[PDB]
């Protein structure tokens, strides 16, 4: 059975086919590759662009989807194996793939990592769980990686530059501040995504400290060898804009200060000069910005990066919608 | 670009057109209007009557409602302008407007005020800034007015009376007991509607205190000067009561007393007799009465009085399906 | 007006209608019977197969659910006759259930007991209500009793032995372990539909304090006399199992310490080898083993157990889809 958990487990030819499928459907939005169908979208995490465009999506191919919410409107949810179920959840996740399995067609999952053990959220569990007991194709909807950010991204990357071949342009993922530490999902899909793109890609953060987990780096050392861009890690502001054609920004907490982010928060603090603002943006090759959204603004991007015509955040957002409407039609 | 924040924006052509599209659609519901199209129904606040007559209506013209509640499901937005966001809210209101504009063709909008500061409140910030921002049209689910409501209020009207014309009846707006300060939303909604109908209206309230916010006032006005009708304030019940064909009941804390509610509770208290009862009713001249739900019985209105074959507030209710389609077909 | 609050309402006669119904669903899926039609699905209490089947059955019979949540997203209801409402509640059911009645063409009703007080709970007040004040059908989603869980479980049980003649099967309900007491509905219910069937019931459970309640045990007795079958009621679990055809498992809190858990902890924790496992599951003729789910692992019962062949929760759950859809159907 094909699911769609991370676009490193597609091939080049599958993951081209899909962004073009999201073209068509880009300029005919209406359709019956879904029709009768379902989608039951489980989130265990807040949504708004995820939620919406899913929904929306499933309704213009002639489908439907139900939201379900563990913990809140339906019963919380237990991943553990071979556990006495005494506790706070109210059954396994054995049972509840089962089910929706009989019910719909599809099932997407959202769950964020606890931020409680980072070798215990690295391996993914919720996900795993969903595609190794569901009957029907599984969609990560954000855990660990972000996926369906990856594939809206590079669309709109493509538009931009009206070419589907990216290679060559030099592209920056570069960290930014926040009050507290985030996931490093979206960062992770970043560097994920522009590798696999065969873009010039440098990891621009504060310390070695905030170089995400290895297991990312190494799918993009061997994405670069495929695809012929390349890697690189700076903790130099100004070098790394500088002849850059994308900024993508996104905050992430340093992963060696996992669980125990008390002495993560003074170092994090002392590097709020990571917002992406005018300055930092003119020193690029006329690059665009974008970030996967929701943005705090003045203080992950100031009010006139957000504002500039540069940013292709916006068009990014939209392409989400069309982006999931191949995805399900492929795996449906 | 079009959008329907309130009646008073609107021409009493382009509003008498609504209620007849509303008459239109209540003889057939089924129809075309928003096929393949979508409203975003974005909830800051409860609902049960709006949510459900929203969702249905978009269902019944073809198309689909997405049902969004920012801090509950989808994240917290921020409303104001050119502010460090490293507090609650997550995303700008600039961003989320050009986000749903980019899937929905149409957005609904509600949010209670604050009560912390009127001053504040009356700005209608929420609602402004989703019309300021979002590239579609954008409809007030109620603020601090209800024109939805004023609409579905006003048909129901028409149809008790059996002609669209109501001048010359006489319409009793009073103030009813709750243990607590609420809205003035709909008050403010049923003066200006009333008015704009040229009927002749009394503004029933205990003291001065509680005359509505001047900018309703004024619109009432100006609508009674241009459709022939009346405006007045009492504090008198029976004089209120007599000859009333119309009595619309609705409960609010003194603008005067907003933020400061600790001093107005003793004050509301020695009203609790402003409750619509068969004795009050029965000084009219054989009059309707209605509430915009939700009602609490034996506070605001006795269960006779609720139970009576002159409340009309069911049917009201059900007008506001009619009526909202009417709105999204008028703005699509 | 005919409703489904209780198969016990229903003939034998329609409940085989409806069976058979359901099973032609199951073969033809997607259908009209509910083309442009709406069920308002009304929720007091969390629900994952519930709510998804409902919305997913209007969806496929060319209808739409409109979800509610009092006291989450819609306005809390007051339920008591004549009483001032100034606490919690916002709105009285008899207007709820006028104002649903404008907009939807079927209601369904979920509010499980409050357990403070069984004399109150067993009266069933919610669903009562919303029967007697609605204009269109009214559907028990699970209040005292689950009818829907009866039918896709007897469908489930036809479907396994091939056969819709259920007579002369063992079938076995037995109380099993929960560290906390639950709800008798599905139990009751249960009891309700194993004996409309005919077959041979055997109610085990610790003492004789967990006998359900007289009415359900007295609509058993009537089943019984009119099916051909027999109830039984037994505290020996190994005489219980012995040559069973069919084992349904639920944990329930003993009615006669409704209020006061407090000393029956102690007496439910002495019985927590109750647990369906394999060993008493082999002491049956080769029979089924079910349970409505959500199902904590481990507790109720064993990892085993649930992943055997012989368990067919699954199938049931599915055919909740089924037979609600030929509920609706026969409503409408």
């Known amino acids: 059975l094909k699911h769609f958990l991370n676009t490193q487990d597609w091939s080049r030819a599958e993951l081209d086919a899909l962004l073009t499928q999201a073209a068509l459907?880009?300029?005919?939005?209406?359709?019956?590759?879904?029709?009768?169908?379902?989608?039951?979208l489980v989130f265990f995490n807040p949504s708004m662009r995820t939620r919406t465009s899913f929904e929306l999506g499933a309704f213009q191919l002639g489908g439907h989807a139900v939201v379900?919410?563990?913990?809140?409107?339906?019963?919380?949810?237990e991943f553990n194996l071979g556990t006495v179920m005494d506790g706070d959840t109210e059954e396994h996740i054995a049972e509840v793939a089962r089910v929706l399995g009989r019910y719909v067609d599809l099932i997407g999952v959202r769950a964020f990592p606890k931020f409680v053990?980072?070798?215990?959220?690295?391996?993914?569990?919720?996900?795993?769980?969903?595609?190794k007991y569901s009957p029907v194709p599984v969609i990560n909807m954000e855990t660990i990686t972000h996926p369906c950010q990856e594939l809206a991204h590079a669309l709109a990357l493509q538009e931009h530059f009206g070419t589907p071949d990216l290679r060559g342009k030099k592209y920056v993922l570069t960290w930014t501040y926040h009050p507290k530490p985030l996931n490093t999902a979206v960062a992770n899909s970043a560097l994920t995504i522009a590798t696999r793109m065969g873009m010039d890609v440098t990891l621009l953060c504060p310390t070695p400290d905030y170089i995400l987990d290895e297991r990312y780096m190494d799918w993009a050392a061997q994405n670069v060898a495929e695809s012929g861009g390349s890697l690189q890690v700076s903790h130099d502001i100004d070098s790394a804009y500088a002849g850059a054609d994308v900024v993508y920004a996104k905050s992430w907490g340093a992963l060696p200060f996992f669980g125990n982010w008390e002495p993560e928060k003074p170092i994090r603090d002392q590097y709020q000069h990571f917002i992406v603002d005018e300055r930092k943006m003119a020193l690029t090759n006329n690059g665009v910005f974008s970030h996967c959204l929701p943005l705090r603004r003045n203080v992950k991007a100031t009010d006139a990066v957000m504002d500039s015509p540069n940013c292709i955040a916006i068009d990014e957002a939209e392409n989400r919608l069309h982006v999931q409407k191949a995805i399900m039609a492929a795996l449906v």
């Open 25 to 40: 459907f880009k300029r005919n939005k209406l359709g019956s590759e879904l029709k009768g169908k379902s989608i039951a």
């Open 68 to 77: 379900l919410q563990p913990g809140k409107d339906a019963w919380p949810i």
């Open 117 to 131: 053990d980072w070798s215990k959220d690295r391996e993914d569990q919720v996900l795993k769980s969903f595609a």
